[model samples]
Target: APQQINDIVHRTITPLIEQQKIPGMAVAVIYQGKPYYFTWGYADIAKKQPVTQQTLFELGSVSKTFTGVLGGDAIARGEIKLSDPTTKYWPELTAKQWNGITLLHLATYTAGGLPLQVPDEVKSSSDLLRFYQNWQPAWAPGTQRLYANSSIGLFGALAVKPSGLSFEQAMQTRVFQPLKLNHTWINVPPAEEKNYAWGYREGKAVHVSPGALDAEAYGVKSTIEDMARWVQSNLKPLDINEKTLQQGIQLAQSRYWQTGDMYQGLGWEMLDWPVNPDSIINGDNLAARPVKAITPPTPAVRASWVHKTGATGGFGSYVAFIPEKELGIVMLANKNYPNPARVDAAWQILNALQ
Candidate 1:
């Protein structure tokens, strides 16, 4: 059954590369704690280097999951608290509403109903403080949903100072070491420069992941080998720090705020059961839709599954896992492909399990 599923993924996804003119793809699925992986095509089109387990790819917004880990660790370590006001960290603000916002609100995507990106007027954390201080609540915190990059970016950045570790160092301590993800990396240290893969741009520009000065809402680079380790760790957690383990799992399914019809937990987004449309009201029609829910006639034998997808200039990735089933699938590609394509890849691999 597993081999058949492996064949299906390779057969189905490779043509997607050729058909879409994408450079390459790497996929890993772990079912019942066993990993099934495949690397097809090239990592560098110009150099013609074939994709290897060690070949790194930009992790895109998937870095949010790691940031969630950093925040959770901070919470567990007593360096940060979810209920603490954001102003507590950067208190040089006069805005009442900004003073009222909590770290929990930022983690949950409910901080003052921000836009996906902040206005040019508020550029950095200082600016976010100012924007929130004077800014009126567009919607009461936690009542409306807006996928704000600035909100999450600010949260990720703040976790650093309060936790007394850089985002890169925090993840290494709390996540990478325990999970054993050797090939997954945030900032490429100067010592490890040779192992880095250069990302390409049109007209022959190639670059390393912009890490130090990165607007960490989206800055990470990793390989299929390391991501496979991540899937296996999340799918089959062994004896580790109980609070840390639970918090990571919580980020997957725990509900934090009501965003129209959906809820969000830490870095994970929530959706309704296909059969339960209007089970909750999503703020405005633009805030969320019923289609975000599960498809009709939900899987008869499926367990609770949490999923997230991410993309950036030349990469796309996905993580999906059913907790009770102890199964997971991760898809990483080196070029931008639509969400449906990534969703289909996951569904195909998941359905094959049955």
Candidate 2:
């Protein structure tokens, strides 16, 4: 298995780096509770900096997985329930259409018909409130699975409302700090900013600009080493003696929806063992399709495979793990390559290992 892994890294992933001219990239694989890392190209091509386990990349929508975890934390603490109405936490979010929308609807992007992005007019809380006052959904709540940032961003805001802390603060205190993920953050602290990798677009470096709700949507930055730690946690949660947190972790990865052949959890995309990664790579067509609730959310202990992909201005990332196989993969590239490429590469390696 290790030799197959080496061949895949050397023969498959390496060519992808050269073929795409990716400036910097990091790959981490976890097998049998151990981590194996491989770095390629430059984190800063012009500066001739090599990519390393320490290099940080913007995690983009993969950040939503953390947002989902925050919701699980709230659920575990009995501060909120997935079935609770959105207006329970944010009364100002009242609309005739929203009356039926629950916290679960928001977290799963099933809140009727929220758009992929917030409207330009919805600049602030006042704007958002006014926008919701007149908002209407084409479909009823929990009837559609639209992949929307606004949906999850609002979910994040409400998830932290009970704790009276900002989303990032709550995440830092509850998730990252508790898990000992020192290299992971929503906003890179000034001291660790040097490790942040600038993304490249068309061979030019571009800065990641956080929008109004980016903090809740696509604002996380993390290193490969930290991600390896995260993968290990997913493999088997830490025995921290905190039953609630452990349960939250399991609940976060639980299956809650099914659309065609695609399986979705709170934040992760789930699959069976011997999955056809190509099916997942092309499943964007079904991302917006209406889904049926799986009923009685099935936790991670019952999950065999889970994954998520992300991209920002100039970065692309993918993470996937198979608990049944005791293996996982994390891929981060500074260049905005297609998710399909990342999926193909990771899948090939994973298939070989099995």
Candidate 3:
């Protein structure tokens, strides 16, 4: 199996870097609850610094899954309900556009008309409120699935507000600290800066570009080791002081809606395992058609494979796991490679291990 894995990575990853121009990547594979690690290319290409499991890379929108976890924790603590109206915390949003939009709508990105990025004019909290005031729905909330960062960014802040902690602190206390993900961070604090990979765009070094609400939407940076711990928690409930936090893990992964072949959970995209590799590969594209009709959640017959992919200007990342298989993989890269390639590599590697 190790030899097969070695051959698969070489066959898949080696060409991916050449064809996609990826400068660096780190990968963590967990099978049967054991972690295996791999890295290739460079953390700093010109400097020739190789990537290691401890080298940090931007997680991009994969960060939403963590926000989803935070929301689950809030639900567990009885501070909020997914079904609660968004107006509960921000009553100013009493406009007709806000109708039918609940906390769950935001968490699941079903707050239908939200744009995919922060509007340039929204530089402050008041500006955000003013934008929402003028906003109109493209479709009724929960009537369509639109992948929007703005939805989850606001969801992250409001989800943690009931705990009386800032988004960062609430996650630090409720999720990060409990999970022992020491190298994971939204700010990538100075002390950990040394491990931060130099993200590359057009073969030039670049830092993660900031966006309004990026902290909650896409600012997470983490290493393979820390991500491996997070991946392990998905494979099983974590040992923590709060039982709710443990419950939140499964809660976040619960299936909420389906459209055609695409499935959506809190922050994860769900799939039945032994899936078509093409389905896994194509599922993460932003421009893909929205699964227009919402299918009701089904009773669980088996653990479904859940995954999320993230991309920033200079980084690409993905995390996928099947709890029933006790298998997961996390991949982080410094270059803005295509999501299909990321999933393809992961699919090939995971199936080979299988």
> Which scores higher on TM-score, 2 or 3?
2
Per-residue lDDT tens digits for candidate 2, residues 40-157, read 8888877788888899998888888888877788789888899999999888766677888998988888888777787766777887777666767878987889888888888888
The per-residue C-alpha lDDT of model 2 at residue 30 equals 90
Over 4 Å off in model 2, which ranges? 1-3, 238-240, 284-287, 301-303
**Which residue pairs in candidate 2 collide?**
none
For residues 1-354, what per-residue lDDT tens digits would candidate 1 score against the true structure? 356876888777877767766666788877776777788777777677777777777777777767766676666567877778887777775567676688776776667576665565655556556665666767655455566666776677777686677777877877787677777777666765554554444434255334322445667778887887776655554435556654554443455554344556566554543213223211111252212212121221224445667776677777766656676788887776676667666766665664
Off by over 4 Å in 1: 118-137, 190-195, 198-215, 241-248, 258-262, 270-302
Q: Which candidate tops TM-score? A: 2
Backbone clashes under 3 angstroms, per model: 7, 0, 0
User: TM-score per candidate, in order?
Assistant: 0.82, 0.95, 0.94
- Kindly list the per-residue Cα lDDT of model 3 for residues 127-181, writing each as its tens digit: 8888777778787787777788888888887898778899999989898998999
- Model 3 residue 220 CA deviation in Å: 0.2
